[PDB]
């Protein structure tokens, strides 16, 4: 269910319901012989967190038999399991070798640490370890510095914390959390901003640009926009997205100004009727009425209610309205 005012709570209706329930705390040093029905829950909870709701087939899991045996012996969760699991091949296949370097840093912050790289210096502190010491010490730097030990215990699974005020990052990194973790029924391969092949927060993670938060499950959860710069120095193109500033005389005339994001724009459903037009279906250049879905607008207050009716009566649906 969506909303922010119904159950007097607002974080469990942004997709963080099942993450707000679990601890997985591993209440003993070594695993008790004779039994496995309690530490198997600890093993699999570490798998769904560190791999990020990924599917691991039973032959893929059986490659990592040795590790799962030492953790069930007298060894610990962070250094003998989560550090060993991130140096296997089942980890390096999905999060390292498929991506550029900054895709790997953004997923190690999400998987191991549970937060977001804010600013260029969190990237650069982790990028420089790879250039001098390879992959097997690049994973160590996410563990053996002064962030992991003060947040997670030696035997707690690294839960998500990039949304709460205790992780003293920023408020722009709050909005970047709800681009990485898009709900509980989602994985890293299964969200449309990173398909295990690219960098999810590339321009917005470097420049610390806050994003509009679109709740998973809302009408408009399919909103995605592509990137192009504008301005002749960086040699960019105008006309793709909307501006994020509302700068001129159109800022304060027609009231205050908002940024609206639309997603679903099909070719039927434009005119003032109920049915699709019949005939040629396209003009002579045969492009479309809307050459791409996911249009965004910048609109004043006194033009917000006529725009709203133009959006919805022509098939579109509103993903986010933020004030500018």
């Amino acid at each position: 269910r969506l909303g922010t005012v119904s159950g007097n709570s607002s974080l469990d209706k942004l997709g963080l319901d099942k993450f707000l329930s679990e601890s997985n705390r591993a209440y003993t040093p070594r695993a008790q012989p004779g039994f496995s029905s309690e530490y198997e829950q600890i093993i699999s909870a570490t798998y769904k967190q560190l791999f990020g709701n990924a599917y691991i087939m039973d032959s893929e899991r059986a490659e990592m038999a040795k590790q799962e045996s030492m953790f069930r012996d007298g060894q610990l969760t962070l250094k003998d399991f989560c550090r060993a699991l991130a140096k296997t091949e089942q980890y390096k296949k999905r999060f390292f070798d498929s991506r550029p370097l900054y895709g790997a840093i953004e997923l190690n912050f999400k998987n191991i640490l549970g937060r977001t790289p804010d600013g260029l210096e969190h990237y650069r502190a982790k990028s420089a370890v790879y250039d001098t010491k390879g992959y097997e010490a690049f994973v160590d730097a996410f563990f053996d510095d002064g962030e992991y030990d003060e947040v997670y215990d030696d035997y707690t699974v690294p839960f998500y914390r990039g949304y709460k005020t205790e992780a003293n990052l920023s408020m722009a990194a709050f909005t970047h959390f709800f681009r990485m973790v898009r709900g509980s029924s989602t994985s890293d391969k299964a969200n449309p901003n990173s398909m295990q092949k690219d960098i999810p927060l590339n321009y917005y993670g470097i420049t610390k640009t806050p994003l509009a938060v679109i709740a998973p499950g809302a009408a408009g959860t399919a909103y995605t926009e592509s990137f192009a710069g504008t301005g002749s120095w960086q040699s960019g193109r105008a006309g793709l997205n909307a501006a994020r500033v509302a700068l001129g005389v159109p800022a304060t005339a027609n009231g205050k100004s908002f940024r609206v994001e639309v997603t679903g724009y099909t070719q039927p459903g434009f005119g003032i009727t109920a049915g699709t037009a019949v005939g040629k279906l396209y003009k002579a250049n045969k492009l479309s009425r809307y050459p791409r879905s996911n249009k965004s607008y910048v609109v004043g207050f006194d033009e917000l209610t006529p725009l709203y009716q133009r959006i919805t009566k022509n098939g579109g649906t509103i993903a986010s309205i933020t004030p500018l």
Binding site: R237, A284, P291
Partner: protein, 57 residues
């Protein structure tokens, strides 16, 4: 609330279809920001809008 008063239509060229696949030299040059123009080509959109609303003079 004083609606606009009703007037009658008239026969014009634009009320009726042209069959015109593959237009020619008298096709009149769509200037759009849906083609993602660069800085040299957004100058041509601006001059075309000045020509249309103002005069050329």
């Amino acid at each position: 609330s004083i609606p606009i008063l009703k007037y009658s239509l008239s026969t014009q060229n634009q009320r009726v279809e042209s069959f015109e696949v593959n237009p020619g030299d008298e096709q009149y040059r769509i200037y759009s920001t849906d083609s993602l123009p660069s800085s040299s080509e957004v100058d041509q959109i601006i001059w075309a809008a000045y020509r249309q609303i103002f005069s050329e003079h």
